């Protein structure tokens, strides 16, 4: 706005100094708002008439009138000048120049201690730092705290004294400048006397400091506290008494006195804050609530140490919504030994913290397993599996859930295969195209070239490594690719040779992203091999890689290792790219030892870093000769350290392989041990070396508490100790601590008076590791079992018995996303556990630690896991893993375990297909749609191929063209076949089947390639249902009304005939109508689950319903329950569409009711959900204000309904406080229906007061639903209310003569048919379900069968399109006969647009804004689908559904380049949209339609697959008053062209 200032001039109101935010600030105040753009510098300026220019950082307030300048130096003469410009907002401009001089005035004085104090003691403790500003002197009192009330006094501090005043310190700081001055105390005799003192002046007016000789140290554990009291003065070792106190509270928790060693042992958990150590007059304190000593630079990192070790693991940690998460678990003690059988409580936790499933998992032959089906609409993000073993210390297995959107484009990158010489330049062939069979034209490809060392350079010879691993400049980045592509799809990249000196095989890797519209690119990578000679040397170690820990990676890694002082064997070859093995003589084979000399190095911002100087030494050398087809074998004696075997050929080509001979690959107290690794029986030789000689104590400890300790005196030549290893030392969380202290309190040369040393105590054993060798072919063909053979080894001792192995196979791509390391149980049970203790000290604070070092280096996923096998006597086993499709690299993994031992196994299998065939098709099809499918076929073999492709259509789909001719494909070439198909009327799926014959492969027989695609097929027009019924007197006849047949196409025409001897209820109709399209709505999902909850296949088939073998049903119930839980809010309440949506109490009550009912039928639901639900319902009852019912017409009725239902739901659980029920009953007049009164009545009847219950029931049966249908927020109707009331009556067994009459009336009332709500269907089902119509005899003659139909219970029978068109029924029974006939089918002609209350219209525009034809659309073209909905009422539950033509796919983005289009979008921004989802074949939108304001909806759509597609009418309805419907016109057809 700001035009309120229009017509006004611009004058300066006030330019002056002021205190702003505690700082001296210059403020100019103008009359009217200024131009907020930063132009203040060439117009308004300040000038010191002495110093000159100053800070010109002009600031403008939230107000546009005041211009500020912060931080002015005191007592300064400032000249402020305002030039004639400034402009302001209404371009008024300031008149002339305004100059004003001002003095900035002095600052108010201040003084106080820089610190509240510290508990650090001293022998004299001089110098008290103070921050003075313009102050000549300070008076300070000096108190001495009473040794009696000392405790309470100090406890009052942090979270009672005499007086020894001296005071008056002369502080002479410079003017207008805050200086840090110190107060001497050395020349104050009445203060050197030990004790606790407090200074106070008259803003930190007081500080504290202690004088004492007692130097205290403390090690706190999770439940134990060990204290060591020694002297600050005479080295170490001291007695004395000490106490542990509470937080704020000065109350004692425990007391003790030091022994002859200084040690003390106390039991304390939390709250034990202040620690106080006295020796008569001397007293030293320690605040344990402060931060402990930082040990970040020590090797103390690791996993927490638990008594019970629960190792959770699986094939992967990255899943997509829909597929099942697999989890395995192994439970052991603190030394990896078996514990007695016990359960474990596992909970699945989704990102927002809520629990999705809670299982008490039992083990099976020692292995815990957990499968969790992720819902199709599961939240993406970080999930946890939370395990409880009983200690209430929660274990957590993290796993990510992500969803990947398709690429809708294809990029092909190819190279020259055969290696190039360094002289050659490298050129890459690029071919990009759209999936619907169109060249990617003008698409800007952007990528990058990389240079890497090729070591796997010969596929014919696996294991052989090529190239000098020591050669420099083998791994660097090259040029960046930016190619406009231009041509119809094709492009060419090139790379000039920056490599010549290279003596190793190189590879140049292109990584390129193809761009569409700056939205979701298609990235691919390709590599070109480069050799320095047509033939090269190659090394393959005979010894196998062993599993070892890498602290940089923090996971178990395979490395080539041999035993210390041994013989390293190697296979050498002289070979080329193709083929194998050539002749050569005089191969120079050197064994190079890599010697490293480590040394520490200090710096300014690096701190103490561990450096090292390396040197390569030639330990061994041999000379070798090789003939044609020979594998030379060399053996080199090795000792210890890192080696590399180097083979050099006469053509100056080098190949090196690094390996190790040993499994081992200043400001602190350096600790050393005699030998790495121990056992619970040996003895430790501990060497302690400190920079400066001193006294203190060493310790061997863990979590829980210390296992050994000793006070020590370390001279200037180190110290040697001998420590025994008890039998109770088998924890792997053991650490060896050392504390050394310098004698003198004061000294020179700085010297850290405190020195700490801390070393992890090695105790593991390499004899308990199962070494796993996984044998499998490095290459295989898809759709054939992958055979993996396991071979275990142990090195020392015999083969353990009953080795359980758990093999898995996962696509390496999925693993590389998360950098997923193959899980190892060994490192889990025997790995280095963390230092579980906090060190509290009284000496100087820790330096900082700088910090610990780090390290530096749609398609359905293939992810399997076989059952656990058991190896034989030789430790051998075999597993088969059926590989589906897939073309890439599988990482085969295996975890093994016995009772005491554990192991890991890795392997890599390249799954590759000879030829690849991909069929691009639309996301679905509609009956009658003709569509052009694109079949891309590529030949990856080295030979040319003549393939015979055979296509076959199955299901609701047929081919239109003849079979393809035989295709001649050259190596690497791709061809495109067009497959015109048509869909068939019906609801189902169509399958395309492809068979490729020929192939030809020397060495392989190979059965012909088969492939199969499925596609969804739905009728373009909504299903039409027609219901009839009648009562037939004895002798009467009845024929099928022509209404059931007219304008409906046969073969799609179903029908159900219900015959009953009493007023019936269409159970099967309710059930069948409760089986609708997803949409994801809560209530819809819940209502649909009630039938499945109370009907087995036995009962279903009796009604003419088949499918789901009960287990499938129960699984569906589970899926439903998940889908329900995925919408429970954080506060326990539920929402209609999503977890972050508005809250609806009635739905909360509903969902809860279903969940309780589900629990009653043996289905599991996490107690968190149930409990928060019940809490929320209870709060609905006891705090009605928390509710917020939106779009209601009668809030009191809404509230009463919600409260009544909640009351019932809780009352069922015996959790409904009667007082509140009565408190509600005293508001019964607000009820706008009988149902709430009924429910509340049952609640009262349930929780005691039967009288008011019966009253509520009787009243309910005489309280008709009264409301002009607006909302009320009970999702209800007269029908559903009467149904649910009858249901409650029948369920609770109450009034008979009422439920009979009501049942009959309801059966009669059910003739408000054709369009019922899900809630109505559910209610009707609940009514019919709990019904007991008893014996009702009936006989009838029909056209269906020669014999009469007869029964005493109501019978439902199915009818085909013929039986139904010829139906005749005649009662041949003595008594009457009730007959119902329900029909359903799909139209033969497009139906006329209808309308009722709601009105829908659709118009298609172009992105330009103009109207667009749906008969001239080319592929890849965008169109705006403009929907408009209107109604003469307030429809809060309006749901828009716009069926797509298969030729259009939706762009998923809400809100929607300009022009009158924006004038539509805006209107969409004014529409209160509840929910919106862009499906594969639908546009959906939950919205409220207010009276007399049209709802505008626009959504973007892209044309893709060429063809002639059916086009359906728009559709809108009221979800719970579904007689209010509208379908609005259609152009008839959609044409998409290439």
TrEMBL record:
The Alpha-2-macroglobulin bait region domain, residue ranges: 669-817
One Gene Ontology MF term: endopeptidase inhibitor activity
Keyword Secreted: no
Keywords on record: Cell membrane, Lipoprotein, Membrane, Protease inhibitor, Signal
Gene3D superfamilies: 1.50.10.20, 2.60.40.1930
Superkingdom of the source species: Bacteria
GO cellular component, one term: extracellular space
Domain annotation Alpha-2-macroglobulin: ranges: 862-951
CDD domains: A2M_like (cd02891)
Family: Belongs to the protease inhibitor I39 (alpha-2-macroglobulin) family. Bacterial alpha-2-macroglobulin subfamily.
Purpose: Protects the bacterial cell from host peptidases.
Name of the protein this chain belongs to: Alpha-2-macroglobulin
């Amino acid at each position: 706005l700001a035009q309120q200032s229009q017509g006004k001039a611009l004058t300066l109101l006030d330019a002056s100094e002021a205190q702003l935010d505690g700082a001296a600030t210059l403020v100019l105040t103008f009359s009217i708002p200024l131009d907020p753009e930063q132009d203040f510098s060439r117009v308004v300026h300040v000038v010191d008439a002495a110093s000159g220019s100053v800070d010109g950082a002009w600031e403008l307030a939230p107000n546009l009138k005041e211009l500020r300048l912060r931080h002015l130096e005191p007592e300064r003469v400032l000249v402020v000048t305002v030039d004639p410009a400034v402009k302001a907002l209404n371009n008024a401009t300031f008149g002339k120049s305004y100059e004003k001089t001002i003095t900035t005035r002095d600052v108010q004085p201040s003084v106080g201690f820089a610190s509240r104090g510290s508990l650090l003691p001293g022998k004299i403790a001089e110098g008290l730092p103070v921050m003075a500003l313009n102050v000549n002197h300070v008076d300070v009192n000096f108190f001495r705290v009473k040794p009696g009330s000392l405790a309470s006094f100090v406890s009052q501090w942090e979270y009672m004294a005499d007086l020894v005043y001296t005071g008056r310190f002369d502080l002479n700081p410079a003017r207008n400048t805050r200086e840090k001055l110190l107060l001497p105390l050395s020349d104050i005799k009445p203060l050197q006397q030990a004790g606790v003192y407090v200074a106070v002046m008259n803003s930190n007016a007081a500080t504290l400091f202690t004088l004492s000789d007692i130097g205290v140290s403390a090690h706190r554990y999770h439940n134990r506290l060990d204290i060591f009291t020694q002297s600050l003065e005479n080295g170490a070792a001291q007695s004395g008494i000490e106490i542990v106190l509470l937080n704020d509270k000065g109350q004692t928790l425990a007391q003790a006195t030091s022994d002859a060693q200084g040690h003390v042992q106390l039991e304390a958990d939390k709250a034990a804050a202040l620690l106080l150590a006295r020796k008569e007059e001397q007293t030293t304190l320690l605040d344990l609530t402060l931060p402990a000593l930082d040990l970040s630079e020590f090797n103390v990192a690791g996993a927490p140490g638990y008594s019970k070790q629960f190792f959770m693991f699986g094939p992967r940690d990255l899943y997509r919504p829909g597929e099942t998460v697999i989890l395995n678990g192994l439970l052991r003690d603190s030394d990896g030994k078996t514990l007695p059988d016990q359960p474990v409580k596992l909970e699945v936790v989704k990102p927002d913290g809520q629990v999705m499933r809670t299982v008490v998992s039992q083990p099976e032959n020692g292995l815990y397993r957990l499968n969790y089906p992720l819902d199709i609409n599961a939240p993406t993000g970080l999930w946890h599996v939370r395990a409880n073993t009983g200690d209430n210390l929660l274990r957590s297995w993290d796993f990510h859930v992500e969803d990947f959107m398709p690429e809708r484009m294809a990029l092909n990158l190819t190279a020259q295969k055969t290696p190039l010489a360094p002289a050659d330049e490298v050129k890459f062939s690029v071919v990009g195209y759209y999936l619907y069979g169109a060249p990617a034209n003008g698409n800007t490809l952007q990528g990058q070239l990389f240079l890497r060392p090729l070591r796997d350079a010969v596929a014919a010879l696996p294991g052989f490594q090529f190239g000098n691993i020591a050669e420099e400049n083998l791994s660097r980045s090259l040029d960046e690719v930016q190619l406009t592509l231009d041509k119809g799809g094709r492009g060419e990249v090139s790379a000039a040779s920056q490599w010549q000196e290279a003596h190793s095989p190189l590879q140049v890797i292109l990584q390129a992203s193809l761009l569409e519209s700056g939205g979701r690119p298609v990235t691919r990578r390709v590599e070109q091999a480069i050799w320095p000679a047509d033939t090269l040397p190659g090394i393959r170690p005979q010894f196998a890689a062993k599993a070892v820990y890498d602290y940089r990676t923090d996971t178990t890694v395979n490395q080539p290792i041999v035993d210390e002082d041994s013989n390293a064997a190697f296979d050498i070859v002289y070979a080329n790219a193709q083929g194998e093995k050539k002749a050569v003589s005089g191969l120079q084979v050197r064994l190079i030892r890599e010697r490293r000399d480590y040394y520490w190095n200090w710096s300014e911002s690096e701190g103490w870093q561990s450096q090292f100087d390396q040197k390569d030494l030639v330990e061994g050398e041999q000379t070798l000769d090789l003939n044609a087809d020979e594998t030379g074998k060399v053996s080199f004696p090795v000792e210890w350290g890192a080696y590399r075997l180097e083979v050099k050929a006469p053509n100056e080509t080098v190949s090196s392989v690094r390996f190790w001979a040993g499994y081992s690959w200043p400001d602190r107290v350096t600790l050393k041990l005699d030998k790495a690794n121990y056992r619970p029986g040996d003895t430790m030789k501990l060497h302690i070396a400190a920079p400066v000689a001193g006294k203190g104590y060493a310790m061997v400890e863990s979590s829980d508490g210390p296992l050994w300790w000793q006070a020590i005196d370390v001279p200037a030549q180190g110290l040697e100790l001998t420590i025994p290893v008890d039998k109770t030392w088998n924890r792997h969380d053991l650490y060896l601590s050392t504390l050394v202290v310098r004698p003198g309190d004061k000294s020179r040369s700085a010297t850290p008076k405190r020195a700490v040393g801390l070393l992890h105590l090695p105790l593991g054993d390499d004899n308990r590791r199962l070494d796993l060798a996984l044998e499998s072919p490095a290459k295989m063909r898809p759709n054939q079992p992958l055979t993996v053979r396991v071979k275990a080894s142990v090195k020392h001792g015999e083969m353990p018995k009953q080795i359980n192995v758990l093999v898995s196979a996962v696509d390496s791509g999925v693993l590389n996303i998360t950098d997923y390391a193959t899980p190892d149980p060994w490192q889990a049970f025997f790995g280095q556990k963390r230092y579980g203790a906090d060190i509290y000290d009284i000496y100087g604070q820790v330096i900082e630690g700088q910090g610990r070092l780090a390290a530096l280096r749609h398609v359905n996923i293939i992810a399997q896991q076989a059952q656990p096998i058991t190896l034989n006597e030789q430790g051998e086993g075999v597993v088969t893993l059926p590989i589906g499709d897939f073309n890439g690299e599988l990482r085969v993994m295996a975890q093994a375990w016995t009772a005491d031992d554990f192991g890991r196994g890795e392997s890599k299998v390249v799954v590759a297909a000879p030829v690849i065939a991909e069929l691009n098709m639309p996301r679905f099809l509609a009956g009658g749609d003709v569509s052009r499918l694109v079949l891309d076929v590529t030949n990856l073999t080295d030979r040319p191929q003549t393939l015979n492709i055979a296509l076959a259509a199955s299901g609701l789909l047929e081919l239109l063209s003849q079979q393809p001719q035989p295709v001649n494909l050259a190596p690497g070439v791709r061809t495109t076949l067009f497959v015109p198909v048509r869909a068939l009327e019906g609801f189902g799926e169509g399958e395309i089947q492809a068979t490729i014959s020929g192939l030809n492969l020397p060495g392989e027989t190979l059965d012909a390639q088969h492939k199969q695609w499925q596609i969804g097929v739905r009728p373009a027009w909504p299903a039409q249902t027609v219901n009839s019924g009648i009562a037939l007197a004895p002798g009467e006849s009845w024929h099928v009304p022509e209404q059931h047949l007219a304008n409906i196409s046969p073969a799609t025409l179903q029908g159900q005939l219900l015959l009953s001897g009493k007023p019936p209820l269409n159970l099967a109709r309710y059930i069948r109508e409760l089986k609708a399209y997803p949409y994801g709505c809560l209530e819809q999902t819940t209502s649909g689950l009630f039938p499945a909850l109370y009907t087995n296949a036995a009962q279903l088939q009796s009604l003419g319903i088949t499918g789901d073998s009960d287990e499938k049903r129960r699984a569906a119930v589970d899926i439903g329950i998940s889908r329900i839980l995925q919408m429970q809010r954080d506060n326990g309440g539920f929402a209609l569409w999503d977890e972050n949506g508005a809250e609806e109490p009635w739905l909360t009550a509903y969902a809860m009711d279903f969940l309780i009912r589900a629990g009653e039928q043996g289905y599991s639901v996490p107690p968190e959900a149930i409990n928060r639900g019940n809490e929320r319902l209870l709060r609905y009852l006891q705090d009605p204000g928390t509710m917020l019912i939106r779009y209601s017409d009668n809030t009191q009725a809404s509230t009463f309904a919600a409260q009544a239902y909640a009351a019932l739901v809780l009352a069922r659980q015996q959790k409904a406080p009667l007082g509140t029920l009565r408190e509600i009953w005293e508001r019964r007049s607000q009820a706008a229906s009988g149902l709430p009164l009924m429910q509340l009545g049952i609640a009262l009847n349930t929780m005691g007061d039967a009288r008011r219950g019966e009253e509520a029931i009787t009243l309910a049966l005489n309280t008709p639903r009264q409301d002009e249908r607006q909302w009320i927020a009970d999702y209800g109707s007269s029908l559903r209310d009467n149904a649910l009331m009858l249901s409650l009556l029948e369920e609770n067994n109450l009034r008979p003569d009422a439920q009979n009459a009501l049942l009959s009336s309801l059966s009669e009332q059910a003739f408000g048919q054709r369009w019922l709500s899900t809630q109505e269907n559910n209610a009707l089902f609940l009514a019919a379900h709990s019904r007991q119509a008893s014996a009702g005899a009936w006989q009838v003659q029909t056209s269906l069968e020669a014999q009469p139909l007869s029964g005493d219970k109501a019978l439902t029978r199915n009818l085909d399109a013929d039986q139904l068109a010829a139906l005749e029924v005649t009662n041949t029974g003595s008594q009457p006969l009730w007959l119902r006939l329900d029909s359903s089918g799909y139209p033969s002609s497009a139906p006329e647009p209808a309308s009722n209350v709601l009105q829908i219209e659709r118009q298609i525009l172009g992105t330009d804004g103009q109207r667009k034809s749906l008969s001239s659309l080319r592929s890849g073209e965008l169109v705006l689908v403009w929907l408009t909905v209107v109604a003469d009422r307030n429809v809060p539950d309006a749901l828009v559904v716009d069926l797509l033509p298969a030729g259009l796919e939706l762009e998923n983005q809400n809100l929607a380049s300009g022009s009158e289009v924006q004038n539509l979008l805006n209107q969409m921004q004014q529409a209160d949209i509840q929910y919106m989802e862009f499906r594969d074949d639908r546009f959906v939108a939950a919205v409220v339609v207010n009276e007399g304001q049209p709802v505008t909806l626009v959504y973007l759509a892209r044309a893709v697959t060429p063809g002639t597609y059916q086009l359906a009418q728009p559709q809108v309805e009221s979800m719970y008053a579904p007689q209010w419907r509208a379908t609005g016109a259609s152009e008839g057809l959609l044409i998409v062209t290439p």
